[PDB]
Every structure is written in C-alpha cells, then in structure tokens.
Amino acid sequence: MAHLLIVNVASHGLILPTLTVVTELVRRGHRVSYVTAGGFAEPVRAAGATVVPYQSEIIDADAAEVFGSDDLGVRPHLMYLRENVSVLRATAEALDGDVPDLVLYDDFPFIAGQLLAARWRRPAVRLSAAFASNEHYSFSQDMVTLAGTIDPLDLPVFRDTLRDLLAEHGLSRSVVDCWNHVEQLNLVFVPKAFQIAGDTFDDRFVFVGPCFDDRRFLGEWTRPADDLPVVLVSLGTTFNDRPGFFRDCARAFDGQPWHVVMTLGGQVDPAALGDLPPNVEAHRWVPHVKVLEQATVCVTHGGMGTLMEALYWGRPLVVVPQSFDVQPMARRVDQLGLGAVLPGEKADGDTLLAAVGAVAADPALLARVEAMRGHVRRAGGAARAADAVEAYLARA
Amino acid sequence: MAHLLIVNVASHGLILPTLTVVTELVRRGHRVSYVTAGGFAEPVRAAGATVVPYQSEIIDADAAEVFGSDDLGVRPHLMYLRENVSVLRATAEALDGDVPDLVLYDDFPFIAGQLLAARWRRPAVRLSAAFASNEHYSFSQDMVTLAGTIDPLDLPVFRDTLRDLLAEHGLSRSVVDCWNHVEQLNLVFVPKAFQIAGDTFDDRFVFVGPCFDDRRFLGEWTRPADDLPVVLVSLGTTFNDRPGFFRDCARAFDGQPWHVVMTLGGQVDPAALGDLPPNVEAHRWVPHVKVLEQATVCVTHGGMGTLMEALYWGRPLVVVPQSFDVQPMARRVDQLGLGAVLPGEKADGDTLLAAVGAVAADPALLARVEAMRGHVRRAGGAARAADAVEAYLARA
Ligand SMILES: Cc1cn([C@H]2C[C@H](O)[C@@H](COP(=O)(O)OP(=O)(O)O)O2)c(=O)[nH]c1=O
Ligand SMILES: Cc1cn([C@H]2C[C@H](O)[C@@H](COP(=O)(O)OP(=O)(O)O)O2)c(=O)[nH]c1=O
Numbered sequence: 001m002a003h004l005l006i007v008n009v010a011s012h013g014l015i016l017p018t019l020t021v022v023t024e025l026v027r028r029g030h031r032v033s034y035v036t037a038g039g040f041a042e043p044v045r046a047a048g049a050t051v052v053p054y055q056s057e058i059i060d061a062d063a064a065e066v067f068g069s070d071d072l073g074v075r076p077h078l079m080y081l082r083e084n085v086s087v088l089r090a091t092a093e094a095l096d097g098d099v100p101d102l103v104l105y106d107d108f109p110f111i112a113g114q115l116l117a118a119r120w121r122r123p124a125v126r127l128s129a130a131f132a133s134n135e136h137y138s139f140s141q142d143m144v145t146l147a148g149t150i151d152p153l154d155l156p157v158f159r160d161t162l163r164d165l166l167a168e169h170g171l172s173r174s175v176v177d178c179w180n181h182v183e184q185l186n187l188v189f190v191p192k193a194f195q196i197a198g199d200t201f202d203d204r205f206v207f208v209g210p211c212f213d214d215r216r217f218l219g220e221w222t223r224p225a226d227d228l229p230v231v232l233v234s235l236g237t238t239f240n241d242r243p244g245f246f247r248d249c250a251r252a253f254d255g256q257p258w259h260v261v262m263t264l265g266g267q268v269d270p271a272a273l274g275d276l277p278p279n280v281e282a283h284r285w286v287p288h289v290k291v292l293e294q295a296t297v298c299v300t301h302g303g304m305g306t307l308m309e310a311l312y313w314g315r316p317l318v319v320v321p322q323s324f325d326v327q328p329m330a331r332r333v334d335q336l337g338l339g340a341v342l343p344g345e346k347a348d349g350d351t352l353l354a355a356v357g358a359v360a361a362d363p364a365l366l367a368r369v370e371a372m373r374g375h376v377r378r379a380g381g382a383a384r385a386a387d388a389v390e391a392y393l394a395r396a
Numbered sequence: 397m398a399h400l401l402i403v404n405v406a407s408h409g410l411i412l413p414t415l416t417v418v419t420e421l422v423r424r425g426h427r428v429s430y431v432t433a434g435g436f437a438e439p440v441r442a443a444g445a446t447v448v449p450y451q452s453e454i455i456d457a458d459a460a461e462v463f464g465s466d467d468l469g470v471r472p473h474l475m476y477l478r479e480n481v482s483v484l485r486a487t488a489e490a491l492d493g494d495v496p497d498l499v500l501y502d503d504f505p506f507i508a509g510q511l512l513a514a515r516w517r518r519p520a521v522r523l524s525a526a527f528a529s530n531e532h533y534s535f536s537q538d539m540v541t542l543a544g545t546i547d548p549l550d551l552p553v554f555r556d557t558l559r560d561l562l563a564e565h566g567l568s569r570s571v572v573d574c575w576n577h578v579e580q581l582n583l584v585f586v587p588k589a590f591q592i593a594g595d596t597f598d599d600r601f602v603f604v605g606p607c608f609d610d611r612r613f614l615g616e617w618t619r620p621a622d623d624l625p626v627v628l629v630s631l632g633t634t635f636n637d638r639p640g641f642f643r644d645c646a647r648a649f650d651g652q653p654w655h656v657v658m659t660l661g662g663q664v665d666p667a668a669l670g671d672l673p674p675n676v677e678a679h680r681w682v683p684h685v686k687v688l689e690q691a692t693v694c695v696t697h698g699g700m701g702t703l704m705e706a707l708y709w710g711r712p713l714v715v716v717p718q719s720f721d722v723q724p725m726a727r728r729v730d731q732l733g734l735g736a737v738l739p740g741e742k743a744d745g746d747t748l749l750a751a752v753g754a755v756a757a758d759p760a761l762l763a764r765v766e767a768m769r770g771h772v773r774r775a776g777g778a779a780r781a782a783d784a785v786e787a788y789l790a791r792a
Contacts, residue, residue, distance in 0.1 A: 141541075153596055200572045
C-alpha cells in the first residue's frame with residue numbers, strides 16, 4: 001500500500017536496528033527506498049530496500065579526532081550540517097520524480113527529514129536508536145552538555161547556515177522550532193521501561209525495543225571449546241581506538257575462569273594486540289547478538305544497540321563509558337541497577353575482572369536484569385513497528 | 397498600583413538579585429509581599445517588602461551532605477517538593493484573604509508559584525537567578541545530568557506526590573506540562589549575551605542582568621593599605637565547606653603581588669584556616685559587590701551572582717567549579733573566553749596563582765571581558781524589571 005523512504009546516515013548503530021523493520025514492511029507488500037552510503041549499501045539491499053546513495057563524510061571520519069580539533073566543537077557541528085545537506089540533496093534528486101508516501105528519518109538526518117517531508121508535503125516518522133526526546137527530556141541537550149561543545153544555536157555560522165537552509169527550501173518553520181521539532185510518530189528502539197523519563201512520552205512515541213537478525217554480514221561466532229562462561233567485551237564502532245584497554249583486558253583474564261570475546265569494531269587490528277591467552281579472542285567484527293545469546297556477562301562501552309541486545313538475553317552488564325555519546329545510557333543502566341559502571345580510566349583490566357565476576361554473582365542485580373529482559377521482549381520489535389507505520393499510513 | 401507577591405525560598409543566590417527590584421516597585425508605589433524564612437526576613441523588610449514567613453528546610457541544610465545521602469538523589473528531590481509544599485501552604489494561608497494582583501516566583505518554588513497563580517486566577521511572573529529555560533535549553537535537565545541524579549519524573553514517589561498535589565489543587569495541567577511550563581513573563585538576572593542559547597529566547601523573557609546595592613547588611617570593606625591588585629576568592633554559600641581550598645590558596649599567594657580577599661560564606665570559620673599572610677584576608681561575609689569594584693581578578697566557583705557582579709565591573713575571571721550546580725556557568729564563561737576555568741581538583745593554590753596572573757595580563761581576554769561588561773551595563777537592571785512588570789500588569 002506504500003512507497004516508504006528511510007532517511008539515514010552511514011553508521012552501524014543507526015542502520016542495524018532498521019534492517020529487520022525494512023524486511024517486515026517489505027514482507028507486507030510495501031516498497032522501501034533507503035538513503036545510505038558505502039558498504040552499508042550491501043546489507044540494506046539484502047533487507048529488501050532499494051538503495052539511494054549519498055556522499056558521506058562521517059563514514060570514515062575518526063570521531064575522537066573530529067571532536068578533538070577545536071575546543072568549541074565547531075568542526076563536529078559543521079560536519080553535522082554538511083552530512084544533512086549532502087543527504088537532502090541526494091534524496092531529492094533521486095526521488096523528486098518518485099515521491100514517497102511516507103518519510104522516515106533517524107534523529108541524525110532530522111533536518112533533511114523535515115525538509116524532505118515539507119518539500120513533498122508528506123507525513124513523517126522519526127526513528128531513534130538511542131534515547132527519545134520530548135518536551136521534558138532532550139537526548140541532544142545532554143549530548144552537548146556531556147561533550148562540552150558549544151550549543152549549535154550559539155554558534156553564529158551554524159545558525160546562519162541553517163537559517164539559510166530553511167529559507168531556501170521555504171520550510172515555514174523557525175530555526176528553533178525546527179531544531180526542537182517533535183514528529184507525529186516516533187519509532188524508538190528501546191523499551192519504554194528503559195527510556196529516560198519514559199513515563200512522559202505520549203502516543204506519538206512507540207517503544208519497540210531492539211530489532212535484529214542473525215546478522216551474518218557481521219560474520220559468525222560459535223560457542224568455545226573450553227566451555228567457560230562467555231564474556232563479551234566491546235568498545236563499539238565509534239570511540240574504539242584503544243589497544244591499551246583491550247590488551248589490559250586480555251592480560252587480566254589470562255588464566256581466569258572466563259572466555260572473552262573481544263570486538264574491535266574496525267579500528268584496532270587484532271595483531272596490534274599481540275598474543276592473547278587461550279581464553280581470550282579478538283575480532284574486527286562478530287555479531288554481538290550471536291555472542292550474547294550464549295553469554296554470561298556483557299562488557300560494553302554503553303552503545304545502545306549492544307545494551308539492548310545484551311538485555312534481550314538477560315545478561316548482567318558492565319558498562320565502561322569512554323565517551324560522552326554513551327554516558328546517558330551508562331547513567332541509566334547504573335540507576336536501574338542493571339550492572340556495574342566503570343567510567344573511563346576506572347575500566348582497567350583488574351577492576352574489569354572483579355566487576356564481571358561481581359555482577360555475574362549478584363542475585364538482586366540478576367533479578368533486575370531478568371525483569372528488564374521481560375520488558376524488552378514485550379516490546380514491539382519489527383512487527384510492532386511495521387504495525388505503527390501501517391496505522392500511520394491509514395490516518396494519512 | 398498593585399499588590400505584588402514574590403514567592404521565593406531561603407537562599408542567598410535566589411534572594412539577593414530580587415532585593416533592589418522590590419525597592420524599585422515599592423518606590424513606584426506598589427505594595428510587595430515577599431515569601432521568605434529566617435534571617436532573610438531582615439534584609440527583605442529593609443528592601444521595603446512585607447515578610448510572609450514559611451517554615452524552611454533548605455535554609456539550615458548542608459547541600460554536600462544532602463546530596464551525599466544516597467546515589468539517586470532521592471533525598472534532594474523529596475526535600476525539593478517539601479520546600480515547595482511548605483511554601484505553598486504558608487503563602488495560601490497568609491494571602492487567601494489578601495489576594496495579590498500578580499504572582500512573581502523564582503525557579504525553585506515554581507511549583508508553588510504555578511498553583512498559587514491558578515488558585516487565585518492571577519497573572520504570574522517567573523524569576524531566574526541563573527540561566528533561563530525554554531523549549532530549546534533546559535537549565536533543569538542540565539542540572540540533573542550534571543549531578544548524576546535520576547530524573548525526578550522517573551521517581552514514582554516524586555511524581556505521585558506532584559500528581560496528587562495538582563489534582564487536589566484543581567490544576568487542569570498534567571504533571572509533565574506542569575514541570576515544563578513556560579511562564580508568560582520571565583525576569584532573568586543575566587545579560588542575554590551571557591545566556592546559553594540567548595538568541596532562542598523570545599519576548600516572554602526580559603534579561604535585566606544583575607541588580608544590586610551596597611549590600612551593607614553583608615558587612616563592609618575598604619581596599620587595602622598595601623595598594624596591591626585585589627583578588628576576590630570565594631566558593632560561594634552552598635558547597636563551600638572546603639578549608640583545604642582556602643588554606644592552600646592563602647599559602648600560594650603568600651608573598652605574591654596580590655591582595656587576596658576570601659569569603660567563607662558562613663561555613664568555615666576564618667580561624668580554622670590558621671595564620672594567613674599579611675596580604676590575605678578571610679571573612680565569613682563581605683559584600684562581593686564592594687570588593688569587585690576595587691578588584692583586578694575575580695576567583696569564584698561559578699555562582700551566578702558573583703559572576704554577574706564581576707562582569708559588571710569588567711573583572712577577568714578564574715572559575716573554580718566544585719559542584720554540578722555552577723558547572724553550566726563555568727562552561728559558558730570558558731566558551732566566551734571570559735576567564736580560565738579550573739574544575740574541582742585542578743584548582744590548587746599553585747595553579748590558581750598562575751591563572752590569576754594569566755587572566756590579568758591577557759589583552760585579548762580583557763577585550764572580551766570589557767565587551768561583556770558593556771552588555772551587563774545595557775541590561776537595565778532593577779529599573780527595567782519594574783518597567784516590564786508594570787507593562788505586564790497593565791496588559792493583564
Ligand atoms: C563493534 C560491533 C558492533 N556490533 C553491533 C552492535 C550494535 O547493535 C551496533 C553498534 O555498536 P555499539 O557497540 O552499540 O557501538 P556504537 O556506540 O558505536 O554505536 O553494532 C556488532 O555486531 N559487532 C561488532 O563487532
Ligand atoms: C559568600 C558571599 C556571597 N555573596 C553574594 C554574591 C552572590 O550574589 C550571592 C550568592 O553567592 P555566590 O557566590 O553566587 O554563591 P552561590 O552559588 O552559592 O549562591 O552572595 C557576598 O556578597 N558575599 C559573600 O561573602
């Protein structure tokens with residue numbers, strides 16, 4: 001009954017929750033256009049969607065290095081607008097003659113998303129792979145706050161670039177109303193129980209939780225031979241250039257009654273770690289969902305995708321936040337008592353060893369992890385998202 | 397001519413900026429009721445207002461301890477409501493028979509403010525002694541994020557109490573709408589230029605900047621006989637139980653080309669510092685406003701009052717934040733290049749000494765500070781506040 005456009009940027013965290021949703025909507029006779037770049041085109045086409053390529057900077061940008069350049073975060077902010085503009089121009093060109101009935105856009109390209117919907121006079125849907133935002137809670141604000149950057153709107157060049165962009169595309173919305181625009185429908189990839197201030201989000205928000213595959217394109221992983229409890233250890237895909245962290249982890253678990261699956265996420269080359277104990281392994285990539293299924297503890301920097309996949313299986317958590325983008329999750333896990341949180345420096349090998357053992361042996365924590373798993377399960381998934389999408393089409 | 401009620405709580409930072417404003421309205425003939433507790437009654441009467449006492453909990457509470465109690469911040473949050481409720485009941489008791497034409501309330505007692513405005517069906521005005529909040533920026537969220545506490549609306553007992561309070565008081569305004577309510581007029585004691593995301597604030601907000609007196613009731617001060625550049629050092633009135641800080645600073649400035657004036661703020665006894673060099677003073681209280689007039693550098697934790705009082709006199713800053721509450725102001729001062737910031741531990745006497753000398757000798761920084769001084773002067777202060785109120789009073 002529809003041609004659905006998904007507006008997104010080139011990032012694992014933002015695309016992976018989307019895949020099984022695409023496959024479900026397509027299963028129901030809908031047709032999907034998907035904005036993406038580079039190697040992401042491959043899994044996106046496999047989910048059933050037609051790929052609309054665009055030129056991305058962020059795809060091979062070094063996050064740590066970008067946020068390091070200057071002390072106000074001008075470089076991050078301006079790259080943000082560029083990625084949005086690059087996405088806006090490429091989608092319009094491709095689909096100006098094939099107008100979608102429904103524009104769905106991730107938080108990141110939300111400027112391009114609003115402008116596209118306005119340009120075509122089409123209903124819109126927002127997708128959140130992290131925490132959702134409303135009048136009470138802004139995932140964006142405490143992003144700025146924690147990151148230490150300048151407010152984007154306090155940055156004259158950013159503000160003017162945006163004002164000229166809205167003006168050009170004639171969107172009848174002011175810069176501030178645009179930046180703080182709440183969409184009529186929002187698909188969020190966490191349970192409401194986990195969402196910060198989740199009790200405050202109304203009907204416009206649908207908390208469907210993690211949506212995932214076997215994800216064979218991230219490789220495959222098979223239960224070990226030593227039959228030791230399995231600990232997943234990963235720093236994600238973004239701020240993951242930390243051979244020190246991984247090497248110290250391998251050392252601490254050397255001879256310990258655990259089997260460690262280490263995930264480098266594309267930065268550190270396994271070889272750069274040197275030799276690992278027999279109970280410790282390291283990959284550029286393995287499907288977290290595949291390790292976590294057989295796992296006992298999950299050690300993660302706090303990436304949402306990894307947290308929700310771990311909680312899906314009721315795995316006690318050890319969160320090792322190394323960057324700002326992940327701190328709200330880590331704060332939320334700590335306050336829900338879903339695991340131990342070792343922020344930055346504190347996440348050394350030895351401390352990480354005591355934490356892994358501690359949370360694996362805590363009956364009260366395990367009581368909370370099991371219950372939360374229950375909310376994740378009773379959360380929609382790809383099926384409930386597609387339902388919302390189809391009900392939304394109806395009202396339009 | 398009117399009866400103006402000022403709803404406030406027993407706190408120096410929240411009451412000081414209000415005083416000269418009261419005196420102006422009264423001077424113009426209006427009659428002012430002022431909600432306060434304890435020893436603040438004296439200065440408030442002086443300003444020319446009629447004191448409405450309420451039983452206060454925060455007036456004799458130790459912030460550091462209160463926030464140290466538990467890991468979620470349940471004790472602070474619940475005290476916050478009690479303070480609000482205690483203020484609600486007292487004022488209602490006193491003014492039910494003497495309804496005000498206008499209800500002016502500070503951010504803190506904003507819940508009691510809204511309910512009183514609704515009860516009596518009167519226009520209301522909000523007062524912000526720190527940054528103001530709107531749809532783009534929330535000082536509150538910034539606070540919770542920085543303090544590491546749970547969102548108050550994620551805390552059942554807190555929201556239930558709030559919900560019931562709103563219901564029992566007839567207010568037809570949901571808990572979340574209530575919490576994120578934007579008043580139709582806001583007096584903000586900050587220049588819009590300093591305000592975070594100032595450009596995003598509309599005409600509902602009037603940035604009148606600092607409003608102060610001789611403040612003789614805080615004692616007096618005559619510049620030294622040694623004729624050294626005077627440096628004001630102060631950790632404020634809230635998280636100021638830090639003898640090590642003042643002790644180490646006095647030690648560092650020993651025999652240095654500066655005259656250090658330290659204010660303990662009713663916490664540490666001056667005697668507990670022990671012997672001080674001839675060029676270092678220590679007081680329970682002296683009017684920052686009088687030191688700052690003769691000063692060369694202001695060293696402060698980031699209290700909004702001290703900051704604005706210093707910028708009023710174009711004084712270079714060394715910001716030494718030791719607590720979440722002054723963290724956004726330290727961030728802002730740093731972004732505007734108005735001074736050096738030495739967060740928490742970084743703030744030893746030796747590093748403080750270099751900073752003081754450094755900010756005093758930076759031509760660029762001084763250009764920026766002198767310019768901000770310009771904005772503070774343009775703000776309009778007490779006169780402009782009464783102007784706004786009177787216009788609001790006539791419109792409604
Ligand atoms: C690094 C890595 C991530 N993932 C998945 C898990 C998450 O759903 C998603 C995003 O990674 P995540 O760890 O959440 O990191 P980031 O903070 O960078 O987004 O990618 C893997 O499956 N295998 C891997 O090796
Ligand atoms: C401690 C102290 C404060 N003040 C004034 C300056 C401010 O306007 C007001 C509040 O103090 P401030 O320094 O801003 O601290 P806080 O963050 O704790 O509120 O008190 C004095 O005049 N003298 C003093 O000795």
